[PDB]
Amino acid sequence: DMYIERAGDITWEKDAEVTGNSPRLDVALDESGDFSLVE
Amino acid sequence: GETTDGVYRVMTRRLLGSTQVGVGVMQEGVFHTMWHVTKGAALRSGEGRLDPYWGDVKQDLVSYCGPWKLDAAWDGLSEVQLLAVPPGERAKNIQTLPGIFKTKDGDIGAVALDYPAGTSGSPILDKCGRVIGLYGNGVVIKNGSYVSAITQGKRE
Numbered sequence: 001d002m003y004i005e006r007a008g009d010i011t012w013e014k015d016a017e018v019t020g021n022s023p024r025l026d027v028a029l030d031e032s033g034d035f036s037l038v039e
Numbered sequence: 040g041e042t043t044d045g046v047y048r049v050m051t052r053r054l055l056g057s058t059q060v061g062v063g064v065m066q067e068g069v070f071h072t073m074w075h076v077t078k079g080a081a082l083r084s085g086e087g088r089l090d091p092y093w094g095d096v097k098q099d100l101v102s103y104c105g106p107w108k109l110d111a112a113w114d115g116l117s118e119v120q121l122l123a124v125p126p127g128e129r130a131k132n133i134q135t136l137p138g139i140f141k142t143k144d145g146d147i148g149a150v151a152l153d154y155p156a157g158t159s160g161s162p163i164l165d166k167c168g169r170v171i172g173l174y175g176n177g178v179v180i181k182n183g184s185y186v187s188a189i190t191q192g193k194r195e
């Protein structure tokens with residue numbers, strides 16, 4: 001039996017920890033909603 | 040129960056301790072999450088019960104109490120913030136520029152941020168604070184690092 005607890009507001013927070021790259025990827029989506037790397 | 044707009048942890052007691060299995064957004068009285076988090080199962084919010092209303096395993100999405108409410112899209116240019124909510128840890132905005140899932144059916148935003156699976160459902164924001172999709176469905180690349188789609192539902 002799952003339950004939910006609030007974890008915060010949905011807001012854009014100016015000066016947040018800016019990280020991560022921006023890769024372009026060829027992918028296939030199956031009927032099970034699993035993504036996979038098409039190479 | 041709590042029906043206040045905002046982001047939420049999805050918890051189970053069916054394992055050891057209380058375990059965060061995912062995250063979701065309450066908006067306009069509707070709770071939005073990823074299908075793989077709840078498997079369409081019902082949810083508790085106080086005594087309050089949430090019942091599934093819409094769901095699609097292929098989109099890996101599901102809404103409770105009403106139809107999918109979130110129609111905002113990545114504009115293809117601007118940066119965005121994963122409002123990540125990890126297990127046992129406080130909500131925390133991470134700003135990033137999305138990459139791209141190129142698929143036979145089209146291009147999807149993707150965010151290269153690595154977080155425990157319990158973060159699945161954490162929302163992704165545009166600069167006006169609108170939710171443009173949910174993190175936690177995607178792919179592992181060469182490195183061993185996780186890349187997630189910006190998964191958005193269709194609103195009516």
Ligand SMILES: Nc1ccnc2c(Cl)cccc12
Pocket residue numbers: 153154155156157158159174175176185
């Ligand atoms: N291996 C994984 C499967 C599914 N989801 C994940 C998320 Cl959200 C983060 C990191 C790893 C994974």
